[PDB]
Ligand binder design. Structure first.
Ligand SMILES: C=CC1=C(C)/C(=C/c2[nH]c(/C=C3N=C(/C=C4\NC(=O)C(C)=C4C=C)C(C)=C\3CCC(=O)O)c(CCC(=O)O)c2C)NC1=O
Ligand SMILES: C=CC1=C(C)/C(=C/c2[nH]c(/C=C3N=C(/C=C4\NC(=O)C(C)=C4C=C)C(C)=C\3CCC(=O)O)c(CCC(=O)O)c2C)NC1=O
Ligand SMILES: C=CC1=C(C)/C(=C/c2[nH]c(/C=C3N=C(/C=C4\NC(=O)C(C)=C4C=C)C(C)=C\3CCC(=O)O)c(CCC(=O)O)c2C)NC1=O
Ligand SMILES: C=CC1=C(C)/C(=C/c2[nH]c(/C=C3N=C(/C=C4\NC(=O)C(C)=C4C=C)C(C)=C\3CCC(=O)O)c(CCC(=O)O)c2C)NC1=O
Ligand SMILES: C=CC1=C(C)/C(=C/c2[nH]c(/C=C3N=C(/C=C4\NC(=O)C(C)=C4C=C)C(C)=C\3CCC(=O)O)c(CCC(=O)O)c2C)NC1=O
Lengths: 96, 96
């Protein structure tokens, strides 16, 4: 499988907000094909960015999400966004 | 009216590609409400970024585009993008 990590940047004190958005909004992509579920990681030390860690059977699994329903997902939340940045770190799973 | 300028960053030699996309690939949003048409500016000196200069009757006119049909527009082109960056510079038209 592959892993996509998204380092999301959130101004101070808006992590609860960004958190309520994964909960009280649309945490729904677990029926995307090849999706193996994600973790949302709140930073405590070494870090100030939220990490979204997602596993997938393949990269084509990932691209089905990104290049399909993601471009149009969560329009309102992205029209009024709480995040101020992101980076997509992309890996191959070599051990477990 | 207001003016939104988008400094699009494009790697070397892909300005023709980004140009075919504004021409032969859906240059169409001139019937978006409050839209007053755009110019696409190819840089020659002082600059390496393409500028998209758009005028609008109001910012709400602009937001109708961005927060409406733009989050879902040109999906394929954004799935295979030729640009590597952008910035939204926003102004009020004070003289003309
Ligand atoms: C649709 C999927 C989508 C794609 C393909 C996408 C591409 C994309 N967005 C970026 C930044 C960014 N993109 C946005 C926001 C948006 N960008 C948009 O295309 C839309 C609709 C919004 C909605 C508000 C912001 C706020 C940044 C960073 C700006 C900053 O860091 O200040 C960057 C990199 C900036 C850089 O590296 O120089 C890329 C490649 N962003 C997306 O959300
Ligand atoms: C593929 C892994 C992945 C998944 C499945 C995912 C789901 C997801 N991303 C969210 C926020 C977000 N998601 C992104 C960016 C992205 N979202 C993407 O799917 C991709 C590929 C990017 C860009 C790298 C950003 C910037 C936010 C904060 C949105 C906000 O400000 O409210 C939310 C909260 C709703 C919201 O605020 O809009 C969910 C449920 N995010 C991920 O990163
Ligand atoms: C909320 C859910 C959300 C989703 C699902 C989303 C989709 C999304 N964001 C992307 C890139 C991107 N999107 C952003 C940032 C943003 N994009 C925005 O819509 C906003 C508001 C921001 C800013 C907070 C950045 C910076 C990238 C490029 C990430 C990178 O490659 O480093 C991409 C292209 C990823 C790829 O294939 O490489 C997608 C599909 N953007 C979202 O925000
Ligand atoms: C301001 C009004 C505005 C309009 C009406 C507009 C239209 C427009 N933008 C395009 C490319 C693009 N448009 C953007 C970004 C944006 N597009 C937006 O409407 C906004 C608000 C942003 C972000 C600030 C980028 C990054 C490209 C290059 C896409 C590519 O690499 O193919 C294209 C070419 C098709 C494509 O490549 O997808 C058109 C016709 N661009 C603008 O900037
Ligand atoms: C092609 C047509 C296209 C459209 C119509 C589009 C819409 C779009 N891009 C946006 C931000 C943004 N979009 C990008 C960049 C990208 N976004 C991408 O989809 C890709 C591939 C890149 C990078 C090459 C960036 C960097 C911002 C934030 C610009 C800023 O706020 O200064 C926004 C929010 C603008 C705002 O209200 O602040 C919209 C509506 N993005 C597009 O690319």
């Amino acid at each position: 499988p592959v892993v996509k990590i998204n380092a999301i940047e959130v101004p101070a004190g808006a992590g609860p907000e960004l958190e309520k958005r994964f909960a009280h909004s649309a945490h729904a992509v677990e029926n995307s094909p090849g999706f193996l579920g994600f973790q949302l990681l709140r930073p405590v030390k070494g870090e100030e960015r939220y990490f979204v860690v997602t596993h997938w059977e393949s990269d084509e699994a990932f691209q089905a999400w990104a290049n399909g329903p993601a471009i149009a997902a969560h329009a309102g939340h992205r029209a009024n966004p709480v995040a101020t940045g992101a980076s997509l770190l992309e890996f191959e799973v070599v051990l477990d």
